[PDB]
Amino acid sequence: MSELAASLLSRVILPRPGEPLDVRKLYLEESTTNARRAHAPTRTSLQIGAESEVSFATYFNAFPASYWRRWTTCKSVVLRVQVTGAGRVDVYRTKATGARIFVEGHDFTGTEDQPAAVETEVVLQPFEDGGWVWFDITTDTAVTLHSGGWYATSPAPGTANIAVGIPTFNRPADCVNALRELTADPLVDQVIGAVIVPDQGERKVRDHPDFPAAAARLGSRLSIHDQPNLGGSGGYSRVMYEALKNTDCQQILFMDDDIRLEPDSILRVLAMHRFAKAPMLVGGQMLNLQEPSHLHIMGEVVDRSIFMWTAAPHAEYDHDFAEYPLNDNNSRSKLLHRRIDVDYNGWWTCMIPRQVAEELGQPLPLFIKWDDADYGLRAAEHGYPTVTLPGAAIWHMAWSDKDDAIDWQAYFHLRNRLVVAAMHWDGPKAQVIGLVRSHLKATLKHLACLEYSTVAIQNKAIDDFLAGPEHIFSILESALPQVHRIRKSYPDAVVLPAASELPPPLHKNKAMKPPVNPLVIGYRLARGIMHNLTAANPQHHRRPEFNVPTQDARWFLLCTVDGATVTTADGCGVVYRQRDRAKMFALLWQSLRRQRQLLKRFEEMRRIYRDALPTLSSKQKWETALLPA
Amino acid sequence: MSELAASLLSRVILPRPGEPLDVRKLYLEESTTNARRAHAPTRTSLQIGAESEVSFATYFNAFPASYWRRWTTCKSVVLRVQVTGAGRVDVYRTKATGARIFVEGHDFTGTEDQPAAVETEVVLQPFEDGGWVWFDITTDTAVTLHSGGWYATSPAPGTANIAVGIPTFNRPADCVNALRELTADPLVDQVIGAVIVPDQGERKVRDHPDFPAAAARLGSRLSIHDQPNLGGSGGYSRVMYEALKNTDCQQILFMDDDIRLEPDSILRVLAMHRFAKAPMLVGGQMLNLQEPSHLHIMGEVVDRSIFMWTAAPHAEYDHDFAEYPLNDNNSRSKLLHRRIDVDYNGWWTCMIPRQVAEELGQPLPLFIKWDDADYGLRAAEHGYPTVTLPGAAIWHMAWSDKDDAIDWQAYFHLRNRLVVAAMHWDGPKAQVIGLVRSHLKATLKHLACLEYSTVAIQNKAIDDFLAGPEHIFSILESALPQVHRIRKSYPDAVVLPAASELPPPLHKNKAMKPPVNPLVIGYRLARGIMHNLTAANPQHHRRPEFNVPTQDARWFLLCTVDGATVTTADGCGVVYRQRDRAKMFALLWQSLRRQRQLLKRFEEMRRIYRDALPTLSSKQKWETALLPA
Amino acid sequence: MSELAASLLSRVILPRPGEPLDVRKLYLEESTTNARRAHAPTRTSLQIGAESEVSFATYFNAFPASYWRRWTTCKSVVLRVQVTGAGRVDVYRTKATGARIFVEGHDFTGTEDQPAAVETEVVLQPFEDGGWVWFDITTDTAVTLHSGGWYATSPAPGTANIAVGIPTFNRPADCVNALRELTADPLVDQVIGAVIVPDQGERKVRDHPDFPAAAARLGSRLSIHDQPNLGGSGGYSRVMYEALKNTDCQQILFMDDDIRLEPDSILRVLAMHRFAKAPMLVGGQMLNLQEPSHLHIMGEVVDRSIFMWTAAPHAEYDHDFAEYPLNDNNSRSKLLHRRIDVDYNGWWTCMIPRQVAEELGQPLPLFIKWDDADYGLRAAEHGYPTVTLPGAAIWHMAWSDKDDAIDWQAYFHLRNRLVVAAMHWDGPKAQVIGLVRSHLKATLKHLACLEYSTVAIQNKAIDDFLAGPEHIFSILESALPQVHRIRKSYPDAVVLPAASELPPPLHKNKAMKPPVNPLVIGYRLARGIMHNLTAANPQHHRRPEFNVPTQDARWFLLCTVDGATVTTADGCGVVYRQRDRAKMFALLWQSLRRQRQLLKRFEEMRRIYRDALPTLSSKQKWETALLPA
Ligand SMILES: [Mn+2]
Ligand SMILES: [Mn+2]
Ligand SMILES: [Mn+2]
């Protein structure tokens, strides 16, 4: 009956026609011994040739059993498939080591008229610290898999009523696409109660030629709110503000505009939220929009030793499922079988229970960065954990090539790290030395790389954090322009269209091998210190010594030049980096001056920042930024 | 004629429809250059496309020639195949190194109406210390292999009349399945004279809904005997008791309830028993029920240096035939071509001649463990060797992941090792130092791992062995509950459903790399000794320092904590392990006290245990345990 | 016209139906991207699917260009193929390094009615020290290759009239097969003028049930000559004797009875003989009858430093073409592109010009071994070189596993080496130290391995060589029985059917790793010397310490035992090897005594042996051994 529909956790899904073979690996893994490729006539069905084997040990179709055991009331899961033809459904699970274990097989024989139903209940008891469940089909005669699903044994609790939030800024076409994809799958459509779009740009999504068609499918569920550029924080703050005040939605789902969606991902997230033992945040993972078979990360934490976000303990960035199948002996694939606990999830997909939003308050008024991490740490302090759910994903731009933490974002990275550190530290007193040491090493590296503007804006970052939580809030919007203004006067921050716009380099490039050798690193380091003590030659600021590609722009090469072009990470331009011994020393001294301030004033900072949390997170205070005159 | 049927050693067999591709490797190996997969219309026939090659150099279809040379009167074997279409049957053998040697080819041309018979006699002379024989088929036109077999040149001696024994304990569904599979193959059915089922559990196999249908196919050959839980020993003791007293079966075949059967396996075992040079025990091998293409072990011995069961000298655990074909250059596969001699076979499949059972007596009244090894050692002392026959296998649970020698089984492992050691030593006087040293190293390891209960029950194991063979017999049933009772008071033995039932750990986990480095092991060892000399902090017994996964729970990580949860091997729960310096030292001292007793009293033990063998193995004394008031 | 037939060097040939895929690699190499396997409807034609590529860079179908350049008058070779369908014939050659070079392509379009002729002349100029020529076919539409050949540009000189010689000894079935295969190919049949069969055994080939049918196809060309067992030398001596006296055949072709033939091989050999610059010996290569895709060796020389036959400088034994294609980057395959010069060819296939046989005389009356090497050295001293022709091969048993130079053959190996050394030395005076040192190292090794009989018969070998060339001739027949008689009294030479015929070993085996480690070899060596100085324990001659498999029977393991069974190389039995310090020392002293004799008397030996060559090689003196009373 529809008792099936109410207990559906995760549908077995298949690729769209014309899907590149790499991406198909996220869905199904076919034996190379098969006569022909399996064919997907719809997104929920599959035709398999006679005498063929297909494995559903895959990102989208395997069941992340250990996560369900850890966070939900589901004691068991039921696999249900409908099949025609003759063959066997084999059910497997893994230990947290990745070791595969055969659970049970079921021979079937069905026809189009009388299709076979194959059911398998798997208890979730043996998944304490990792493991997946999946099935394979090995055929006798040609087989059609008409449908498949992972089901709970009882209906989902609560009511499904999601407010989806999508902040957008000068990407009307991406936003229109996102709105369109939300209503593509009828089952996702039915559970969406509202779509809040804080439009923070000048190029409005409302003015896009395809907007009316996307807007029609949502009807009055859609609202667009014009506001100034308040970054991610202001965007998602608005979303949460609107959801609590102007809707009765039980779940708040943060999403993003520049995404591609696998709609079942939303239902998986929702299912985990509904079956949850206690209220919690449920997050989706990010697949790399530019390398679509690659998983960005299983989950992330905040490392408390230096208060810095990182990969969770047994997780590694950029896992290509086409090269490294889930069910494979290699070391990268085995890591995927551990249950990865997280401190927070990113806001490309993050479900927040209504009550939880109410109790915790709004995002901190940081512009970009650390706002998601803060909201995870805050939630945990209130006994609301976060789970990053494997197999529930969207496609989003990763820092795949195109990004570098040396531009204006570096200001926000440092400032907000400090704000959130002050807000959540809890650890011993002398623990801040770790964070400052971390920053010193990075500072000397920037100076070695001639990334002078970076250091300057990081000096402003420290000043702004030190000025307190009231100054932070007052510069929600003004902070960005002020960072640009500082950067304009540094040659290392002025992007030119091409190296060919400048005089041709004095020297041709020579391939320099990266020093792994212990003695050689020392030698390159000393050579760098020695050069940095000399007065720079001004002629190398008129004509660059080298044109350095991004991939070659490393400290060991850069710490011996007086002047060079360095290509930006996105490959779109170059900057003329220039050494000046007087400026370097001055920036270094200003940095050290600030480092000593941080470790002197950090305890005070914790007090004032924790005392300001009611204010920084109140809907009323946020109204002063969100709403105009 | 049926002169063929009487001399059949081993049928050429093929996979069931829908069999996973991995498992098919146990039967046939097909070239990837073939246009299509070979098709098995029945379990004894195969269709092969035109211009295709299939190799029968496989676990089930190759002939383990060296074993037949060593233990049977067969001077040669005849390969007989019936084929239609046109092609070549090529016959090969190996040297004990694995080197393949072409013996002879036979071109054939047959039709469905006039099928071709292809015969090849292979003398068993060149297989002194290893080697297999097999065939390949390379086709011209499409070929059907209608049947194939390895045959002796004369009828099998003796009469085939097997009593199959299956002890069962609270696994009625598995037992019913086993009973069902015994009658699946008509040729196995015909040679079964009785099926004895000692039902030792409370959930009776007789009460299972599918039992009547399984029981009908056996008729009056089946008998079920209710008795208390007397472990494996009591179970198999009952089987042997019933077979000798209440049947006239010439062969006794020990099996198990949680198995999957390849019925031809039984006939292979029987064939080797019948053609045997002199009476002997014939055992089957175990394929891993959870990784079905994996062989557990070629055979096992008792290493006399420390009296401990191990892999036979050139055998390695867990051989995956899908990754490592029999006929392949790699080092793991070459080992399979040596004739592996064994001291004993396990009781998942072990054929014992009626007369031999009569002369040797019953199993020793050990609860679990070492009873099979003892029966092999005992048989050898009477001039009855054991053979583990390759290609004759059942599927059974291996210690594949799910088992750990630290629970209640550790008591039985140590106690019974000592009993069997006392029973069979024969070696020099000072030889027991080896066994005690072995136990000391294990003891210190348990204490390092905080596995305190293990040490305590191993202390009881030594006491029970020391009390003598009469005490051993008197605690056949009572020993198990008494072990549980000791374990209840150790935190390291109380299983909780999840780490989440306890307060969250103080520290997050950090990946610790296993020390292979020589200096680093020393450093980790010293760090462990140093920590173990400090007084433990009681707060770490309230709140665990870490949640440690099974795979990470190693001595180098565990010897530096005061308190931590460790997940059980099966992944079903966790235990709160807790360091206490006073308890550790006390357990260690109690262990050392016992170690010194062992090497002082071992000679005495041999005398009293050897003198008690008539008693411990008599059917009359066993009646006091097997039969009620 | 038949001007084509007269200039044919080497036909393009294809496998028989049902040929194992490995062996097919000797003929054709097909791309795995092809839809279907190529099909050979006859041995000289091939069907190739549409859009497919087949390479004829193979043992049998590529042209060994450098050999033809070196030894024949052919300035160029013409490739001629007849094809239907549409595609391209691509012609390639290699440098001696293996580097492939594209020469020329030819698009064709033919039909069954109007087949396309594709011709390509390749000049042999760039093959000074290596290189092959071959073709590939890449198809557009389905293609049939109807025929292909490598042709000279002018008719073959001389007259083709071969006397084939096949000595046989108790292998009537193999001999009958050889006779049968000689007439299988009409083109080989036509050039055979006689078949001489010295039947040296008691089981006569004449008495074989299939002999009359084989004999009918040869008619009066076949003659069988009964004589005593005079080994290989007597056999081939008889062949040459009969060919010169009783036929007018222009070529003498030594073959063997236990062979499989690729008939075109004979024509290739004949073609090279006819086109030769000057008269020469043309030999065929040996493919491994037991591993049929493996080449035994490209060619062999006599290393003058110690006067011992070996692989030619850049040749390595046992080249598997299925694993290592001719046209492949790997190091083993690149060696195949050098022109390998030889000192001699073996007598499995060796063509000798009539005049050359006349001038050189008969084989030396050695029983087995070194007779072929001598005949090559002798021929070279008369300005008649030997060529081993790649791509011209028979299948013959290699020393693939089944042979060990420790039995009765060791006597002949040493004695004949000395005879041929005395006959051909030429080098400096002090050069014999090398040969004696070589023998000392081998002697100490035999004694270390307990191979005592070997040393004793090698002591007789030296004595027999020292007694002179007249004694050698007088013991042509009697030498074999006399070697057996010596060996009967050594336990290490008495073969027993199985280790199980002896008392069971004292110790089980333990895997000993082969010492590659520099210090460890030293340690094992010292341990061996130390043990060999002790008095052996007689009880270890009653009951063996170990049962040692052939593969494990190495000096480092064997030099520490007093008594052990060692399995024979063929796996058919075992010998009880026994250490005795008194016997060892006595044999060693007798060996050293002889070693000092050799280096004192070697100059004398050269004189007497060279002076006896007219006698040892005269047909008249050979009549005293070949013909009865
Ligand atoms: Mn985005
Ligand atoms: Mn069991
Ligand atoms: Mn031969």
PDB file of all heavy atoms in Angstrom, chain B residues 401-414:
ATOM      1  N   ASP B 401      36.394 -12.054  10.241  1.00  0.00           N
ATOM      2  CA  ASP B 401      35.992 -10.808  10.905  1.00  0.00           C
ATOM      3  C   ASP B 401      35.280 -11.001  12.253  1.00  0.00           C
ATOM      4  O   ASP B 401      35.669 -10.394  13.254  1.00  0.00           O
ATOM      5  CB  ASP B 401      35.125  -9.940   9.975  1.00  0.00           C
ATOM      6  CG  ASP B 401      35.839  -9.548   8.689  1.00  0.00           C
ATOM      7  OD1 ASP B 401      35.912 -10.374   7.755  1.00  0.00           O
ATOM      8  OD2 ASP B 401      36.304  -8.393   8.607  1.00  0.00           O
ATOM      9  N   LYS B 402      34.262 -11.861  12.264  1.00  0.00           N
ATOM     10  CA  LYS B 402      33.248 -11.909  13.331  1.00  0.00           C
ATOM     11  C   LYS B 402      33.690 -12.505  14.682  1.00  0.00           C
ATOM     12  O   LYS B 402      32.929 -12.462  15.656  1.00  0.00           O
ATOM     13  CB  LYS B 402      31.984 -12.634  12.822  1.00  0.00           C
ATOM     14  CG  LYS B 402      31.515 -12.245  11.401  1.00  0.00           C
ATOM     15  CD  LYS B 402      31.070 -10.788  11.296  1.00  0.00           C
ATOM     16  CE  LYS B 402      29.731 -10.564  11.976  1.00  0.00           C
ATOM     17  NZ  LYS B 402      29.402  -9.119  12.077  1.00  0.00           N
ATOM     18  N   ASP B 403      34.908 -13.043  14.744  1.00  0.00           N
ATOM     19  CA  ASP B 403      35.388 -13.726  15.954  1.00  0.00           C
ATOM     20  C   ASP B 403      36.608 -13.067  16.621  1.00  0.00           C
ATOM     21  O   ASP B 403      37.475 -12.513  15.936  1.00  0.00           O
ATOM     22  CB  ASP B 403      35.681 -15.206  15.652  1.00  0.00           C
ATOM     23  CG  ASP B 403      34.414 -16.065  15.575  1.00  0.00           C
ATOM     24  OD1 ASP B 403      33.499 -15.884  16.414  1.00  0.00           O
ATOM     25  OD2 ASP B 403      34.344 -16.941  14.681  1.00  0.00           O
ATOM     26  N   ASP B 404      36.652 -13.133  17.956  1.00  0.00           N
ATOM     27  CA  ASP B 404      37.818 -12.697  18.746  1.00  0.00           C
ATOM     28  C   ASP B 404      38.129 -13.621  19.938  1.00  0.00           C
ATOM     29  O   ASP B 404      37.275 -13.843  20.806  1.00  0.00           O
ATOM     30  CB  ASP B 404      37.700 -11.223  19.189  1.00  0.00           C
ATOM     31  CG  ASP B 404      36.362 -10.890  19.871  1.00  0.00           C
ATOM     32  OD1 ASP B 404      35.532 -11.801  20.096  1.00  0.00           O
ATOM     33  OD2 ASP B 404      36.143  -9.694  20.181  1.00  0.00           O
ATOM     34  N   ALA B 405      39.364 -14.136  19.964  1.00  0.00           N
ATOM     35  CA  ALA B 405      39.842 -15.109  20.962  1.00  0.00           C
ATOM     36  C   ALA B 405      40.057 -14.508  22.362  1.00  0.00           C
ATOM     37  O   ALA B 405      40.950 -14.922  23.110  1.00  0.00           O
ATOM     38  CB  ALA B 405      41.126 -15.748  20.465  1.00  0.00           C
ATOM     39  N   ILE B 406      39.225 -13.533  22.713  1.00  0.00           N
ATOM     40  CA  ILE B 406      39.360 -12.812  23.972  1.00  0.00           C
ATOM     41  C   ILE B 406      38.145 -13.019  24.877  1.00  0.00           C
ATOM     42  O   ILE B 406      38.190 -12.693  26.062  1.00  0.00           O
ATOM     43  CB  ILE B 406      39.628 -11.288  23.744  1.00  0.00           C
ATOM     44  CG1 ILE B 406      38.491 -10.639  22.932  1.00  0.00           C
ATOM     45  CG2 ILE B 406      40.993 -11.076  23.073  1.00  0.00           C
ATOM     46  CD1 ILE B 406      38.416  -9.117  23.017  1.00  0.00           C
ATOM     47  N   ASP B 407      37.067 -13.570  24.322  1.00  0.00           N
ATOM     48  CA  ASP B 407      35.855 -13.815  25.104  1.00  0.00           C
ATOM     49  C   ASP B 407      35.922 -15.154  25.836  1.00  0.00           C
ATOM     50  O   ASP B 407      37.013 -15.651  26.120  1.00  0.00           O
ATOM     51  CB  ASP B 407      34.573 -13.670  24.258  1.00  0.00           C
ATOM     52  CG  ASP B 407      34.571 -14.550  23.022  1.00  0.00           C
ATOM     53  OD1 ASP B 407      35.383 -15.494  22.938  1.00  0.00           O
ATOM     54  OD2 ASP B 407      33.741 -14.293  22.122  1.00  0.00           O
ATOM     55  N   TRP B 408      34.760 -15.719  26.146  1.00  0.00           N
ATOM     56  CA  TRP B 408      34.663 -16.963  26.902  1.00  0.00           C
ATOM     57  C   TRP B 408      35.376 -18.139  26.235  1.00  0.00           C
ATOM     58  O   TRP B 408      35.764 -19.096  26.900  1.00  0.00           O
ATOM     59  CB  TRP B 408      33.201 -17.310  27.159  1.00  0.00           C
ATOM     60  CG  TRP B 408      32.362 -17.399  25.929  1.00  0.00           C
ATOM     61  CD1 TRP B 408      31.654 -16.388  25.349  1.00  0.00           C
ATOM     62  CD2 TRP B 408      32.129 -18.565  25.129  1.00  0.00           C
ATOM     63  NE1 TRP B 408      30.998 -16.849  24.230  1.00  0.00           N
ATOM     64  CE2 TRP B 408      31.271 -18.182  24.073  1.00  0.00           C
ATOM     65  CE3 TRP B 408      32.567 -19.895  25.198  1.00  0.00           C
ATOM     66  CZ2 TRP B 408      30.835 -19.084  23.093  1.00  0.00           C
ATOM     67  CZ3 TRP B 408      32.128 -20.797  24.223  1.00  0.00           C
ATOM     68  CH2 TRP B 408      31.274 -20.381  23.182  1.00  0.00           C
ATOM     69  N   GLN B 409      35.560 -18.057  24.924  1.00  0.00           N
ATOM     70  CA  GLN B 409      36.235 -19.117  24.188  1.00  0.00           C
ATOM     71  C   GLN B 409      37.712 -19.247  24.557  1.00  0.00           C
ATOM     72  O   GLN B 409      38.307 -20.309  24.359  1.00  0.00           O
ATOM     73  CB  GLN B 409      36.052 -18.923  22.680  1.00  0.00           C
ATOM     74  CG  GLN B 409      34.636 -19.234  22.237  1.00  0.00           C
ATOM     75  CD  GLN B 409      34.396 -19.005  20.772  1.00  0.00           C
ATOM     76  OE1 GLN B 409      34.512 -19.924  19.959  1.00  0.00           O
ATOM     77  NE2 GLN B 409      34.042 -17.777  20.420  1.00  0.00           N
ATOM     78  N   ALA B 410      38.286 -18.178  25.113  1.00  0.00           N
ATOM     79  CA  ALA B 410      39.713 -18.151  25.447  1.00  0.00           C
ATOM     80  C   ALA B 410      40.013 -19.154  26.548  1.00  0.00           C
ATOM     81  O   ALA B 410      41.067 -19.798  26.532  1.00  0.00           O
ATOM     82  CB  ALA B 410      40.159 -16.743  25.852  1.00  0.00           C
ATOM     83  N   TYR B 411      39.078 -19.284  27.490  1.00  0.00           N
ATOM     84  CA  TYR B 411      39.149 -20.305  28.542  1.00  0.00           C
ATOM     85  C   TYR B 411      39.318 -21.702  27.953  1.00  0.00           C
ATOM     86  O   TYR B 411      40.183 -22.459  28.391  1.00  0.00           O
ATOM     87  CB  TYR B 411      37.890 -20.276  29.415  1.00  0.00           C
ATOM     88  CG  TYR B 411      37.689 -21.531  30.238  1.00  0.00           C
ATOM     89  CD1 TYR B 411      38.284 -21.667  31.495  1.00  0.00           C
ATOM     90  CD2 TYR B 411      36.902 -22.585  29.762  1.00  0.00           C
ATOM     91  CE1 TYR B 411      38.102 -22.818  32.259  1.00  0.00           C
ATOM     92  CE2 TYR B 411      36.720 -23.740  30.513  1.00  0.00           C
ATOM     93  CZ  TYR B 411      37.324 -23.851  31.762  1.00  0.00           C
ATOM     94  OH  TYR B 411      37.135 -24.985  32.519  1.00  0.00           O
ATOM     95  N   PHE B 412      38.485 -22.029  26.966  1.00  0.00           N
ATOM     96  CA  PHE B 412      38.493 -23.346  26.355  1.00  0.00           C
ATOM     97  C   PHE B 412      39.698 -23.540  25.463  1.00  0.00           C
ATOM     98  O   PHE B 412      40.248 -24.639  25.402  1.00  0.00           O
ATOM     99  CB  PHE B 412      37.192 -23.609  25.601  1.00  0.00           C
ATOM    100  CG  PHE B 412      35.989 -23.662  26.496  1.00  0.00           C
ATOM    101  CD1 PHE B 412      35.204 -22.531  26.695  1.00  0.00           C
ATOM    102  CD2 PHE B 412      35.654 -24.834  27.166  1.00  0.00           C
ATOM    103  CE1 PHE B 412      34.095 -22.567  27.533  1.00  0.00           C
ATOM    104  CE2 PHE B 412      34.550 -24.880  28.007  1.00  0.00           C
ATOM    105  CZ  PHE B 412      33.767 -23.745  28.189  1.00  0.00           C
ATOM    106  N   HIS B 413      40.126 -22.472  24.792  1.00  0.00           N
ATOM    107  CA  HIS B 413      41.316 -22.540  23.951  1.00  0.00           C
ATOM    108  C   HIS B 413      42.520 -22.968  24.769  1.00  0.00           C
ATOM    109  O   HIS B 413      43.246 -23.870  24.368  1.00  0.00           O
ATOM    110  CB  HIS B 413      41.599 -21.206  23.260  1.00  0.00           C
ATOM    111  CG  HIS B 413      40.892 -21.033  21.951  1.00  0.00           C
ATOM    112  ND1 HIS B 413      39.930 -20.067  21.744  1.00  0.00           N
ATOM    113  CD2 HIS B 413      41.025 -21.686  20.771  1.00  0.00           C
ATOM    114  CE1 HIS B 413      39.492 -20.138  20.498  1.00  0.00           C
ATOM    115  NE2 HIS B 413      40.139 -21.114  19.887  1.00  0.00           N
ATOM    116  N   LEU B 414      42.719 -22.341  25.924  1.00  0.00           N
ATOM    117  CA  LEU B 414      43.885 -22.635  26.743  1.00  0.00           C
ATOM    118  C   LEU B 414      43.775 -23.976  27.467  1.00  0.00           C
ATOM    119  O   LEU B 414      44.712 -24.769  27.437  1.00  0.00           O
ATOM    120  CB  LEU B 414      44.200 -21.494  27.729  1.00  0.00           C
ATOM    121  CG  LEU B 414      45.436 -21.716  28.619  1.00  0.00           C
ATOM    122  CD1 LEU B 414      46.748 -21.733  27.828  1.00  0.00           C
ATOM    123  CD2 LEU B 414      45.493 -20.688  29.714  1.00  0.00           C
TER     124      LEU B 414
END
